[PDB]
Symmetry: D2
Subunit: 116 residues, 4 copies
């Protein structure tokens, strides 16, 4: 599990559950290749996205569908989603946790990177 | 204006207006002395808090009355307020902006420090 | 000035100056059309991006070239940049400020939306 | 474990390890009663702070000594520490996780609150 995603609701102070996440890879022809996807769990975390063998070096894009999240909560947010674009394992493969903290008009995203 | 405070509402995507702010300075006898205070303006900013003559080297605490903010909006938040403790002008006077971004269950505070 | 961008350096506690910003609008054919761009000023703010006549209803993407920022500071960051996708003026024109707060391995983005 | 604390470094994108945390309780005579304390672990988390029996309703203050953290890293930060003040279990006892995201001139803190 070299890539993980974690979403929190800054308003309710809880994990955002059942939040849709889409991962893409920068295509060699500078286009966005779909790579993985899934929805967050009860704990606001999405595991088992990819494997070490398929998570190779390159440029990645993580999209958290935050517009669907707030609406379902009875809200109407500002953003469409959140977008974390980064280069992966250019230094050897690390574990990547992408955390997101969401609010209707604001978000934060942190990349926690670790060695085995 | 050597010390200013700016507050944003991360839920409404707007200035936080009429927000109470208390500034304190760590006393020689190691307790907190009331230094200054006010409420934010319609731009969610607070000006004319102190002066260069009065804003000397020292340890400062900025308390933003954020619990009273939320409730007045028709909400009920988590924190009693936001707190920012920092040492100032320990290398000459600077202009200090303390900006806060508030959510009922989370907040962020940034110090923008500029030279004359 | 219906759309403005403001960037802060969460490490240095200062404006992020000369930062590249690209704005795009979701095309009818569902691709991203270049809408506007510039670099931040010494106050880390970017003005005169578009106009009321040109800033119509639509889905917008604000990309802040934050990877180029850090490296130019003598650093090497995590993200390729910051991304903010949002729908604008879907209830009339508003003034939109997109503020970003950057760290090599994390960032936050806030939309301050005001009425005339 | 009704109270937990988690610290992340927004600069290195890693857990902050061995970070000192101090918890206090609002004394009935409006003073700050020490309640618990400890340093974060390898994973940037501090567990076993208190117990359900001793974590009663009231106003609490969590202080993360961030000035010692950065310095040890070869830095000299801005803040003295971070300060999360909140009322606990006024609705029945929840588990409280206090997360902090630190940068030399900025910090964020989120209260993730859960039911058994």
């Amino acid at each position: 599990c070299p890539l993980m995603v974690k979403v929190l609701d800054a308003v309710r102070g809880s994990p955002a559950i059942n939040v849709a996440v889409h991962v893409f890879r920068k295509a060699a022809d500078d286009t966005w290749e779909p790579f993985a996807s899934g929805k967050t769990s009860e704990s606001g975390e999405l595991h088992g996205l990819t494997t070490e063998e398929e998570f190779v070096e390159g440029i990645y894009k993580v999209e958290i569908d935050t517009k669907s999240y707030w609406k379902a909560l009875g809200i109407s947010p500002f953003h469409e989603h959140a977008e974390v674009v980064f280069t992966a394992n250019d230094s050897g493969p690390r574990r990547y946790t992408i955390a997101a903290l969401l609010s209707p008009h604001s978000y934060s995203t942190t990349a926690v990177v670790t060695n085995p």
